[PDB]
Amino acid sequence: IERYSREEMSNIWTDQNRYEAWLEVEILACEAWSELGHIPKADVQKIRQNAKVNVERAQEIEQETRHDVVAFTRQVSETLGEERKWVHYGLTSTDVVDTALSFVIKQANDIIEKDLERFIDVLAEKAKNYKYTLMMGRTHGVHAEPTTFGVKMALWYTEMQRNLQRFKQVREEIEVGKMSGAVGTFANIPPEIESYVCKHLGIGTAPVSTQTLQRDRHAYYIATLALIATSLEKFAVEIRNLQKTETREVEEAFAKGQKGSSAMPHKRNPIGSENITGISRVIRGYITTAYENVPLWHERDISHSSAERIMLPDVTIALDYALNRFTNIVDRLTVFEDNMRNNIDKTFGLIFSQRVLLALINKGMVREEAYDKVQPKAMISWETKTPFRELIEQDESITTKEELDECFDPKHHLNQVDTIFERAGLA
Amino acid sequence: IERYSREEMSNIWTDQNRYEAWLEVEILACEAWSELGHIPKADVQKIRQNAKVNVERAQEIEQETRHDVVAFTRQVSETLGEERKWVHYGLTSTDVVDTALSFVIKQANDIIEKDLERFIDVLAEKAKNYKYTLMMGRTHGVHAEPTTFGVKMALWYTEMQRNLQRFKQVREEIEVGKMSGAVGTFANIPPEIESYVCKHLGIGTAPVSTQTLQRDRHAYYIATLALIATSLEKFAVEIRNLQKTETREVEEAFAKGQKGSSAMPHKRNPIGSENITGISRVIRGYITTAYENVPLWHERDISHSSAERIMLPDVTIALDYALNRFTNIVDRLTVFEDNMRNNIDKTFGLIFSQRVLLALINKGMVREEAYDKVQPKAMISWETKTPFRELIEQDESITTKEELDECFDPKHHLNQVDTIFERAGLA
Amino acid sequence: IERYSREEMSNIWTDQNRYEAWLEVEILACEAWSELGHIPKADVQKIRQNAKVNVERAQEIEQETRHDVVAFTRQVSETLGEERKWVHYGLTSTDVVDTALSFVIKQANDIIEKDLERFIDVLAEKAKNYKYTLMMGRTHGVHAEPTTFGVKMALWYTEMQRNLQRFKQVREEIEVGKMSGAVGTFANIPPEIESYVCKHLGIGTAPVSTQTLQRDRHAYYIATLALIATSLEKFAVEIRNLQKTETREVEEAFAKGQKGSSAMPHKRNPIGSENITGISRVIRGYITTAYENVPLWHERDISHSSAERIMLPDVTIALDYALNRFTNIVDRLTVFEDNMRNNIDKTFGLIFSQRVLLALINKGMVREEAYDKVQPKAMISWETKTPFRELIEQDESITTKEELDECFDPKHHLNQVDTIFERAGLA
Amino acid sequence: IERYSREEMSNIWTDQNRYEAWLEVEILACEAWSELGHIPKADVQKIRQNAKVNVERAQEIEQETRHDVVAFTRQVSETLGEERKWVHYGLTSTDVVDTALSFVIKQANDIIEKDLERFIDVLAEKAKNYKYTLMMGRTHGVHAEPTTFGVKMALWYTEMQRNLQRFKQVREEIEVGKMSGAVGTFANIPPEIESYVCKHLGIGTAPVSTQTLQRDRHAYYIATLALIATSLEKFAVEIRNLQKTETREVEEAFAKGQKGSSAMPHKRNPIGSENITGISRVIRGYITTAYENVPLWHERDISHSSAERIMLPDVTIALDYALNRFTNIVDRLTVFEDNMRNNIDKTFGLIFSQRVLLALINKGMVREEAYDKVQPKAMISWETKTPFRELIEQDESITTKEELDECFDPKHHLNQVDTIFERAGLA
Ligand SMILES: Nc1ncnc2c1ncn2[C@@H]1O[C@H](COP(=O)(O)O)[C@@H](O)[C@H]1O
Ligand SMILES: Nc1ncnc2c1ncn2[C@@H]1O[C@H](COP(=O)(O)O)[C@@H](O)[C@H]1O
Ligand SMILES: Nc1ncnc2c1ncn2[C@@H]1O[C@H](COP(=O)(O)O)[C@@H](O)[C@H]1O
Ligand SMILES: Nc1ncnc2c1ncn2[C@@H]1O[C@H](COP(=O)(O)O)[C@@H](O)[C@H]1O
Ligand SMILES: O=C([O-])C(=O)[O-]
Ligand SMILES: O=C([O-])C(=O)[O-]
Ligand SMILES: O=C([O-])C(=O)[O-]
Ligand SMILES: O=C([O-])C(=O)[O-]
Ligand SMILES: [Cl-]
Ligand SMILES: [Cl-]
Ligand SMILES: [Cl-]
Ligand SMILES: [Cl-]
């Protein structure tokens, strides 16, 4: 997953940054105790200045201590003088590990939120730039009635707007800390320590907690980040569908898939969209794992920790990369407006049959009289390969021909587009 | 799943009720068109009065029509006179199927919401009724420090309060209708029809839609209802853990598992909690299915419909039954307050070691001097089977014995309970 | 799931049939004990003759007994005289429930195995009937080189042949019984009882067991039945792809989707394939549930039982219906051999570029000289809309034109078909 | 996942080793063509000697080529002279990528197979070393009847023996190659090339293939490797259950969890087992992803490739580490034989009630007379806290007391152990 990681998200999930987050939690812990008259401020001002993380040293110590917080606590302590004594004062491993983890998630969520807002903009501009670009609506892969590429982009815009709303919400659920002690009873640690750290780390407090944060928070979070990935797959599948050789209504404007410098000009592949699809299949795996991490035993068990070492970075790193790669795909996406408008007539004008029927009935004609002077001619249009108009024009529906144009006009279906865009927040 | 269905939820997912929901949508559709001057109101007032659903008749017609909305449309039409003509006027199958489905979900969500609020009350009363009931906090299945059964119930209370909040939110996402036509372009159906129906059905409108509602709504909904099921499993696993023979700290007060009328008095099983666990394993299955229903093709494809015929009833029926069965389990749950307080001393008072250490250091003693007059005696307490006090009392820690009571007092750990309950909204 | 159930599989999962399976297990249990001189044979010959199941009576008794085996045991006992006493002699609930469940699975597996062999035949005949039917191979949805519809059906044939092989194997894993007593120690029940029943029920014995069969058996079984469902989805997605309006290379020969008796002749939908896709999304859900049923506690816990009440019938009923509906779809599937052969030339003969290149180099020409008298003309073929031949024919590649036919001949790609069919076991 | 990776498996999934596997495939490809008289052997003997992989160079070239096989092909080519020309002769990207991937899996499967056989040995020795170690069988977490720790280890031994059998099978499904060309038609590449490479790489041939291997192979493989992970979780959950403070029947002999050098001797945690549980939650995620990779489009689509870049290494690396860490846990696992035998009497001898009942009836006594001189005394044993014997001895069941020893003897339940071990293949 170094091939599928952008730099900013990748750095967040390094050991450097996890230990630095433990340090901040620890130091802030001492600042909290100090306001409560347990530790002299001078000693804490010393700690902030002299404390340095060393990933290699901590990991040397970890092979003997067999415990990762103890190792960290010892490492930092080797960079300090006497103020060593206050490092981790009246705290338990997971008061740090878990408050710090929520902090790092807050950092990851800052990125993903920006990715989401960017993608929403890309979708807003694509929508407006193809507002009236007629193409075929398709149901079961079959031509039904026309629509516009702009409307399809508006469909996506509002989906993402739903997905952002969600994500914003789950952030308040997940960016939450805990410093409630060995069993969540605040027995040997007042709640004002938690209150202090979490305010300064810019996160909230779990009102009631165990040794660890409650994992229904994490699970919904994964659920959410997976929903975003799934709808990215939806969009990617659209592009894949529309880039098919027989359609050619859009094209990933990357030139990828070959043929640019070769003699195979037809090889225009949606491999980026295929990529996004496959990453989506991974993000969704961790729905299982995140959900199975909820039934921890009693106050705590640590099984969730090994699983979320792999899942939390993977899922945020994958999601960050998918959001941006597909934001680019969509931005650069090449839309063939003429191929779209051409494909409207692959069904020989049979999509405008109900309109010719209606046009006859709304002209003094009987509900069945009009039906028998359309249906048989409509049939022959499909069986032979000739326009639906040319067969209608032969029979006496003439005396009208001045406005069969209106029945066969796909621009009829644009009549509510301005409202669809208003509804979507794109006016 | 007739063994795991309560009556009110079961009736919602019958064919009677689905067709009745199609009828209401249809009739309301005609009321909408009528205000728009397409249909005479008299004909619609006729329709409401004369239209009757017949599940057997519709299904007879369906074996030849091979289409379920057409079948319905024909059935109702046989119960009407001339006003037949306006049934389904200017509508497409899925404008009804899907607006009606969202309506039936609204009905299911009314039940589940009530189940959630009831369970929250059961948890509020259990919390207050055991606010100060000392038991052992357990980490990795091992004794750590004391806590109270009331606090554990408060932990659950706030989880559910999170889960309700979620559920309330997703309801606004899911209880949403659509009457936007064959491809979501409003081309041949003004949006004021959708607006009319959905207001009268008490649901909202999808701003931009395809032939069908967008399935990220459904998926998050399932996600959510599965999270609630997973945390029910969490709680059920707690009960299972605590009802183990070696613990006996709680007991499903059902008398189930045998021994009441037999000569096997020790067989007190948590089979209800085991049941809830197993249903939870089913609800979570449909996370997959709901998520894989999102990548529909273009304007629509119908694959989601076969999957949500089974999933939507199953998941709501299962969840309704799990919420209520476990609400009862918890309400009736028998708590052995004495067994809890006894088990605190299965570790021979070794849980109060840090407090004796502290008590010595906070009395003029050196940080290490106090450590060497606890640790070796603490060790011998575990290896032999004798109280930690009796070995401390032999050595000159005397000159104090008047308040070793305070070090060995588990009621120390109650000092923040009143605040934990205040935080949880149970003051 | 009454809409998605065939009759034979549906009957297997009724209460009638589960109780009848408990009866047989019980009776056979008594026949076993009898050979071991615990029960007189006359009493057992009585039992077989007089014992009748009554689903309504058992369920009446179950509302007070609160236990389903006890209820059954009491019901049957009301249909017997004195020989009542031997019903369930020296047995525990789950020795019956679970040996009987494996038996009912054996019955379900008889159906599915037949469904699989039928589908394999349908695929063998489709393969042979289109052995040489040229169509376009497609990669990333884009034209690559030709293939034949027969070869594509052979691809499916061998997949299913893999899937049958698997299924055959997992049957030996799952069609396995247990009568080892309360904790699997054979303490109060010799193994020759288990041996007797299981031989007569036509199933094997779990060498070492707990109170219950070990659920890794069930999980692999579900895994398997889900793999079969997933590859059915694969095939269904192919059909869906190929039935798209722009392709029209195949068509579900059902006439479903409308237009037969209407004036919308273009509405030829693959709704059956869409259906199979959606059922597939359900079968895969129960991968989760089956796998989470493996970590039972100690000798047993009953959580697996509530989950497999719903899963085992659902998954077998769904899979039986999907196998047969799609076997029919494929059998009746209408293949448009001319549309296939036409679509080969939608890329204007650009798929035969490497062959013209090769044909020049394999004629005294330089590896690059031939490349510059193809590539630029190939490019112009795609940009304009004119055959690749017509632009090649203008330049002096003439002096040859007698066998540009061989370069542009798609029948080149049939040269190994007879071997592909031999490899697949279709010669 | 560098914290959860052993070295041998980790090296297999490096870029060095993937490119080296591409090289071997390529070179072998040239050896195949050479036997077929397309390439001079001297040129291929040159290629084998001069071709060197360079991971950094290939990745430099990949940022411009935007294609990873082309990049590789160019890199190796820079290490060769004129024999460059034959590198990748008449092959397509995925003939190499995918034949090579199957090869690397073969390598991974060599490791996992060894891990499985080692774990099976560890389980065989544990079984024999505790063959007769009496402990309580537990159902619903409650005492039922005795069993032995040896029998429980035999239960695990046979499970793993099932899991190995499976794994052996799926290896033949997965360790399979493909060199069938752009669309699997062998059109421009005889099957004897595939035959040649795959024989020399020690893998089999896919009889019918597309551009890529068919992903039902991979999915079953993941399914399988996840089943093994799930049963590891089962075992780990057992250990976790049994190491609980109230039980203390086993203990991870690592000394991990603290208290060795501290004054908290009761902190004996099963954190290794907790770890294995959490990794298991990850391996199972990729059931989803592997299964969703099966519906590729037509001849191929590349979405499976991004997902199996992450999944295939992760799942094999995780599984290798879980198998070995838990093999060690089990080997070193400390069994408290005395605590086991003590816990048998936590139910006050009530587990031997049916045996006292039987002992009275099998002595001239009536089926009900014996029931009323046990049940009421059994009840009082549980309500008070006094042995079941002491209350039986007060009533005239005397005139017998010489062999109440036989009724209350747990060594009764060992009577079939020698057969359970024979059944399991441990005699
Ligand atoms: N009660 C506990 N709270 C926090 N960390 C712990 C606890 N017990 C052990 N650990 C350590 O935390 C790490 C967990 O490992 P892992 O399962 O790989 O995340 C190991 O270094 C453990 O020794
Ligand atoms: N475009 C469509 N919109 C709504 N329903 C349809 C459409 N096409 C077919 N149907 C019918 O809806 C039902 C879908 O079946 P199922 O897949 O079992 O939910 C069948 O009766 C189909 O004939
Ligand atoms: N140890 C046991 N073995 C078999 N069945 C049991 C056991 N304990 C309870 N049962 C009953 O089996 C059924 C399990 O219910 P369910 O969870 O719905 O499958 C109920 O009727 C239980 O009372
Ligand atoms: N038809 C194809 N066969 C094999 N590889 C391809 C094909 N098309 C593109 N690729 C390349 O294979 C890699 C796939 O990327 P990923 O999705 O990250 O595995 C990229 O370098 C693609 O450019
Ligand atoms: O050692 C500790 O404090 C822990 O594990 O929480
Ligand atoms: O027939 C219809 O209207 C449909 O299928 O939507
Ligand atoms: O009552 C029984 O025998 C049981 O539950 O197994
Ligand atoms: O370029 C190629 O050969 C490919 O992508 O398969
Ligand atoms: Cl929390
Ligand atoms: Cl929507
Ligand atoms: Cl078994
Ligand atoms: Cl294959």
Numbering used by the authors:
A (entry chain A), B (entry chain A), C (entry chain A), D (entry chain A): 2 to 400, 404 to 431
Passage from the reporting paper:
In this pathway, adenylosuccinate lyase (PurB; EC 4.3.2.2) catalyzes the breakdown of 5-aminoimidazole-4-(N-succinylcarboxamide) ribotide (SAICAR) to 5-aminoimidazole-4-carboxamide ribotide (AICAR) and fumarate. PurB demonstrates dual substrate specificity and can also break down adenylo­succinate to adenosine monophosphate (AMP) and fumarate; therefore, it also determines the levels of AMP and fumarate in the cell via the purine-nucleotide cycle. PurB catalyzes a β-elimination that is thought to occur via a general acid–base uni–bi mechanism.
We describe the construction of an efficient bacterial recombinant expression system, enzyme purification and crystallization protocols and report the crystal structure of PurB from S. aureus (SaPurB) at 2.5 Å resolution. The SaPurB subunit can be divided into three domains that combine to form an elongated structure. As will be described, SaPurB forms a tetramer in the crystal structure and this rules out space group I212121. The tetramer contains four active sites, each formed by regions donated from three different subunits. The AMP phosphate accepts hydrogen bonds from Arg4C, Tyr5C, Asn276C, Ser306A, Arg310A and via a water-mediated association with Arg326A. The adenine N1 accepts a hydrogen bond from Thr95A OG1; N6 donates hydrogen bonds to His141B NE2 and Gln212A OE1, residues which are themselves positioned by hydrogen-bonding interactions. His141 in SaPurB corresponds to His171 in E. coli PurB and is the catalytic acid for the mechanism. The oxalate binds accepting hydrogen bonds donated from Ser94A OG and Gln259A NE2 and a water molecule that in turn interacts with the side chain of Thr95. One side of the SaPurB active site is formed by a mobile loop that links β5 and α12.
